[PDB]
């Protein structure tokens, strides 16, 4: 029932006032440099993480190059070993075949030596029969 | 965030990629010559996300087609929309990768990669605001898996601030091309965990099972599998291609879907499931129910076996937005135990008036579920069974690889599984 | 002269800006081309400057880190109302990431925005300060706005800064990380804002469904309603009113302590335009509606708090006798609990200018309306809900890598959260005895 | 592009080469003069300015008789005289003469001609070497050639089509010696070797073609069909293609385990209804259709490549393979989760006019890596041991510069190979 | 491996050698003037193995005729086909060797050997691809045995990489020319074991017994014995003279037939057994059965008494290849015990359409049997019986020989027997 109306303002398209039902029980700098500092620190963290990503990708490219080179090195070692094993085999075989033919011809030469000795022995009986 | 640059690598990548361009071209009113003959401004509003405007009123896909063999490229050129592609964007070698990740990644692929980068650089340089890259490829072969992951690493080095998105086809013995698929896949997953922002796991095991069990195809072909993939790809890219509020670009999608950097492998879901020949209902309540159905997942995992970290649900066709909102709330309330409590409001919904080609109504789910660990476990078991006996390893070490790379790739993928399991068991009282 | 410069940031700020300036033009008889066929008030010059061609141009700046939304303003119905220079856009948005808006992308466009603001300030003979419209949830609305507020405090030391901030709601939200953005922006903005009027998208959404019979409200529906509330608050600056006649008076009448500067807005009546001819609501009916939580701009229960100040802003066919009679009956039936140190009472203002509605809109034209602005400790409920969502995610560090990747330190999350914990404690302490 | 160089060594290699190149010409529409009134055929044929299509092949023999038939035959204009290389005296069924004594006098000439063919290749895939295990040239000259090819071409792919000896048609008692010696020497230089058992082909000709006493002409025409099936994936562009690298990767789990078993179907008499994809695929797992006599039921599969040709669609292949995957009797090793690789080509099997084989709508050649093929090594090693225990005929090799240590080393390597097949078949 | 150079030494050598040229000339369509008048391309396909092409369209045997006495060479010149031979290829002395190995090997033969080498070098040097040499001679006389083995050693020295093949006639008391034949034979075997790659053992004991028992010739002449030899020689050289796969040259035959270097003495077998110009055919089964028949062996050994190390079987005439293959498999299956188990697939078969002169069908067997030790044992016993008493030893020591040569030759031949016995008893274990 005890309502206190206090007039505040009056104007051309308005009217205002305050209505008090009960009074109160208890009576009663950012800087541009600081902002810039924070944005630049965030930009540096973004830049740093992107650089670390690209550094990791660069290490992948290095690995890719090492695997191509490894395949090439394995192929070259295969060729080299195949070449030396084959040269060893062909030379060892040539030495063996030559040895086998030298041994056979030496046996035949000994037969020829023996035949001349047989003919010589015959001459000490033939004609030499008084 | 306007232009996306699309790359498709290897046989699988080019086959699903060609089907993607056919579907979205039909949806956007683009014919095989590149001419717009549609009757809706919604079709052209965001057409520059995937298409460049060329001489006359023609639209040319911002697509780069890659292979280490010319065969696949010729087949795409002769295919239905083969003439729409920019002829200079076909980049191909002659040697092939011999189903060998090491050949695609280190030897043959390395010899072709700079020619591909030149084409993708030309496309990227002409973008007013490049979003990033979208790669379609398989993980079981040599080119898509090995050369595709090599491309991702090279693209990351030149465009470290752009989004890298992949549609990665996971191998299955159910429909296999080579014996070394588990090796190729594990080596690729190792690359994807580190170098992609978002990867859609398109599992051939799941695609086969949908065709066999649901569609009753006794003997599914790659064409039957690719009809599911093209529909899924249309659904997951709806928000990028048409005007909308939610996940309208590759980065905003990644911010909503990826709570931890390594956990970026999505389980796509789609309803209704149809065959190419079944051009024969589906209510809003029924469409929403398929979110928890293993039979609707394009990754062979059961969503009831884990928990959703995040979900993006996309409804297409003429339907009540109010009914969609009501059913989406009901699905979360009725399935509380399948969503992590420590990511509030982790399910975002979008509705587009334009339905996918051949359908009147549809729903696509992009889920980041901890159940995806089942896919990685399956690959890991197949990998271990071979690696334990070092079977076929000489074909990889012969390319210069070390056995330590295999151990490391396997270890990283086993760590990925543990990480999913850790968050699956995590409670809101950490 | 007492000029006010309006700053609209991000999609929410820009789209709400469109609704506000459309309404101001209708209220002042300004056409979309800036022409005004003009008795009379003259007070509209606080919000509109005049050109040599006789065109009235808003003292406003529209800023977004992406051009799509502002492009609709550049080519829309009101393209002649604004000069190209006041519509500022970047190329790439903040991707719902406060760190991206504040530290990475925002940093490239701040100086351009401040230059344009300076050019508007130069045209003022008695600048009051700024009215900043933005969302809590977007990367630009959160990140760019806090960066802008900091520089405005450097360049305009004394000058008042009032906010109209959109509090996030799941029914219309576009990002899981909105709680992060909301806390981060509140922490950085807190000491730079003098008074902030929060609008909870859920409260507006429910008022549109309940009172306007809109099945699924769109941003257009929400923004037209928000514009009515903004217009009610700014009416006394744009017409020769008697209460809140300058920006400093908002702080004088509503803000007893610097940190507790978030008044609760209540508006009535909200009636459907398609309502089968209703008999006009009385001063008693619209005044009773001020004390109903269903009409609040933020979801909270004033029963669970104490009032520190209450401003009743009436518009239209209203006489003091009817206001006093209405307040007298409310006090008799209800406990309008004020804190011990403040008097239990109301400052009442009547602006004779009628409530204006957009032709063809959802709101019905009424003979009288009221907007109550009350500084209640109940609004801390909104902070508690937001802080809880923040804590659930932050306990696991979910999505934190997105912020750290943009150069923000993990420690800023703890600092911002600790500041909001102190704010919740302040609301508790102020409401004590 | 993607060129393959064929090398035909000794009588068996040359005569099989005649049958192959005759068939390739018929399949590609190339006349015996080289004129041709797809494009993939360029992998096997180069082109001259005059429009002549010339085989990327070298025919080598240490005696001139067999290659002389090529020089004066129907296809004498097909090959330039330079690619038909012959000496004067053969290796007399002696590995030592083919490898050392006689072979060393003609290796440089052969390598020079191969280098000239390789110079005409922009993307050389590898070499296909055709030879017998039993002849002195087929065993000894082939081993020497393979070693020299590893020197000049490093790891460039080298695939073999090797004739495994059979008593019904063999010409030498020492064929087991020559077989083990060449296998030991060649093992580390070959990436993949397709063995053809003469007894298996002989029995297929008697059973399926009703030939009372098959001749080399009968055997070689059938072999020519199997070789064509294997190489059709490189000479045509079909629905699914398999290159030399893909054969290697998919068939060879370990370097030494590189001997796939070849199975072919259908083999039907030109007298004598069309067999479905399921029927011809099922026939691949029947021992009666194998190129090597062995029992896959006594072993495990490690890999299976199916090469189809003719009226075949992927859907029918997948249905056929799915039913094969369910067969309990067809056992794979536990370390092979995925064992199939399929290739499909549209050109139906071409048959030589006046031949024994009937023209069919579809055919298939399966290449499988089975531990059962170790049975072939066991039979050969046993014959080797019987003679070597007494040193029978060893003097012929020693006389030519070889040492008994080479016999023991070669035999020990084959013992390790038999052990490898046993180890690889074991469960983990 | 094209040309073969043929040498025939001494009486026996020139007599069987002339008969060989008559038979193969008839088979190849060559008349006594050297002109081809046949009607089959098969006859000329490999004619150059034994014949040179001379002025006109004539074919001249690549044959050298040798003897230390002019007699047999005059008889060859006057015989049928005597005019076919190159006149300059007749090399002969006047002195004779007196059926004494020492005279042929060391004295008279040594005086004529260079004149022979002149002629064989001329023939060999004109060969595009010389296979080797083929010598026909007896072991019991002096020229064929002594000078023939001297020629082998001289030829080997000049052509160490060529094949040395002999048709060696073994002596028998049943049809003997001298008392010292066991000495001449043992001394020759000693040379053959060391210097030949393949030797066909043509035993006069076996030839006599076939003529006496089978052909019922009460008193056989060398003409009757030589009809069996000419037929055998035609059969064993079939694969060298006509197009074929198996044993097509002297080296490939040796690689298939000789498992140990010293064991190169072959037991030739032939069916059917006929007398001169007498027309009487056997079935393929009957022809195959003769492989194990002692009555069909040209060496007086029983194949059932030992084991076959290796066998080359040659069927001639119009017959079913399938039937031949079936019967040959049946003979090895039914007679497993008579083949060494440690030489797998040791029986190789060839079929030629052209039958030998005067026959419609025939089979020739070239066997490397351990039963051949019976032939060497017989010679060795005859040798020992004489040498134990040093009988006639001055006939050799008078020519300059030492008794140690006799001991060595005997020892080597006894070692040869022990070696055959060792492999006969060897098991696969
Ligand atoms: N009331 C209302 N809320 C809006 C409007 N547009 C967006 N919002 C809300 O604002 C939040 C998203 O912030 P936005 O303003 O769209 O984003 P932004 O400021 O442009 O920032 P970025 O696009 O992330 O750079 C969500 O809670 C939206 O529901 C609008 O016009 N009205
Ligand atoms: N399939 C088949 N096998 C053959 C053919 N020719 C020979 N053989 C076999 O190969 C082996 C003999 O080797 P060849 O190829 O004839 O001899 P080579 O390589 O010419 O060696 P030499 O003549 O001894 O220098 C035996 O097993 C024969 O059956 C043929 O045309 N086809
Ligand atoms: N869904 C699907 N998978 C395919 C397709 N083509 C191949 N694949 C799969 O891709 C893998 C083989 O890789 P592929 O792309 O053909 O090899 P690349 O050319 O070396 O990339 C296997 O898992 C195949 O099942 C296709 O069109 N659709
Ligand atoms: N089969 C056969 N044996 C003969 C012939 N002439 C001689 N012999 C045998 O040869 C041996 C005598 O050697 P011979 O050749 O006459 O003496 P040479 O002139 O010194 O060689 C004895 O064993 C004779 O029986 C012949 O024409 N045929
Ligand atoms: Mg925005
Ligand atoms: Mg040969």
Numbering used by the authors:
A (entry chain E): 4 to 31, 44 to 145
B (entry chain B): 1 to 280, 283 to 432
C (entry chain A): 1 to 38, 44 to 438
D (entry chain C): 1 to 37, 46 to 280, 284 to 439
E (entry chain D): 1 to 280, 283 to 431
Q: What did the study's authors say about this model?
A:
GTP tubulin is known to assume a curved conformation in solution and a straight conformation when integrated in the MT lattice. Here, we modified our original method for the preparation of human α1β3 tubulin to purify Drosophila α1β1 tubulin. We first determined the crystal structure of Drosophila WT tubulin within T2R, a complex composed of two tubulin heterodimers and one stathmin-like domain of the RB3 protein.
For WT(GDP) tubulin incapable of nucleation, such oligomers composed <2% of the total.
